[PDB]
Amino acid sequence: VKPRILLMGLRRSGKSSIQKVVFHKMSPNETLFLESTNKICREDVSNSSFVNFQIWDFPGQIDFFDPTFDYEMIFRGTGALIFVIDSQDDYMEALARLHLTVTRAYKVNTDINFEVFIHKVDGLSDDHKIETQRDIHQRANDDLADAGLEKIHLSFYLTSIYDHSIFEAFSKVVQKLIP
Numbered sequence: 001v002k003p004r005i006l007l008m009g010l011r012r013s014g015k016s017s018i019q020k021v022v023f024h025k026m027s028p029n030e031t032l033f034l035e036s037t038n039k040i041c042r043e044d045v046s047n048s049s050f051v052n053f054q055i056w057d058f059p060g061q062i063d064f065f066d067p068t069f070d071y072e073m074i075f076r077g078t079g080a081l082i083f084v085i086d087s088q089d090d091y092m093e094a095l096a097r098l099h100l101t102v103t104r105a106y107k108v109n110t111d112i113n114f115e116v117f118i119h120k121v122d123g124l125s126d127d128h129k130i131e132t133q134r135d136i137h138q139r140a141n142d143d144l145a146d147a148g149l150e151k152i153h154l155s156f157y158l159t160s161i162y163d164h165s166i167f168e169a170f171s172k173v174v175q176k177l178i179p
């Protein structure tokens with residue numbers, strides 16, 4: 001089996017940058033040249049001296065009807081779902097889509113590891129970080145409870161492509177997919 005890791009979230013949250021930086025060692029400064037993602041981009045990690053994975057980079061979530069992705073088929077084969085959130089922008093909508101994403105996925109596969117990347121933290125005071133994470137952690141788990149889905153576990157990470165934090169976070173995600 002080849003474990004799948006999904007990169008989801010609203011447009012511009014930094015999904016593609018994360019993929020390029022972490023797996024293609026693209027420089028963080030080069031990500032300024034990336035363009036909006038229009039189709040899902042699958043990039044596999046094969047023959048790993050640790051563990052092989054499929055990395056799916058999704059275009060940002062928008063209210064556009066297109067029942068062509070067969071999400072049940074995607075989630076069924078998913079090991080980890082990373083929801084990326086831009087911490088330097090309003091995230092109320094981000095939280096709302098995280099809720100729909102997580103619950104829809106959980107309905108198909110309860111073994112999915114849900115990882116929340118509170119991204120672009122490089123632009124926050126080393127305290128504003130604590131508050132943002134505390135706020136996202138609180139609301140997200142509160143939404144889950146209001147739905148009777150408190151059992152769904154959400155891990156949170158403070159990340160930035162401008163330092164080791166994004167690698168440290170991705171590392172912990174991959175570790176959890178190695179039996």
Ligand SMILES: Nc1nc2c(ncn2[C@@H]2O[C@H](COP(=O)(O)OP(=O)(O)NP(=O)(O)O)[C@@H](O)[C@H]2O)c(=O)[nH]1
Nearest residue numbers: 011012013014015016017031032037060120160161
């Ligand atoms: N400050 C900061 N900027 C970041 C970080 N990660 C990405 N960015 C910036 O955010 C921009 C948008 O990133 P991008 O990867 O295109 O976002 P995306 O979610 O893939 N967008 P879409 O969903 O439209 O394809 C990048 O061009 C980059 O300059 C980060 O850790 N910190």
Ligand SMILES: [Mg+2]
Nearest residue numbers: 015016036037
């Ligand atoms: Mg993208």
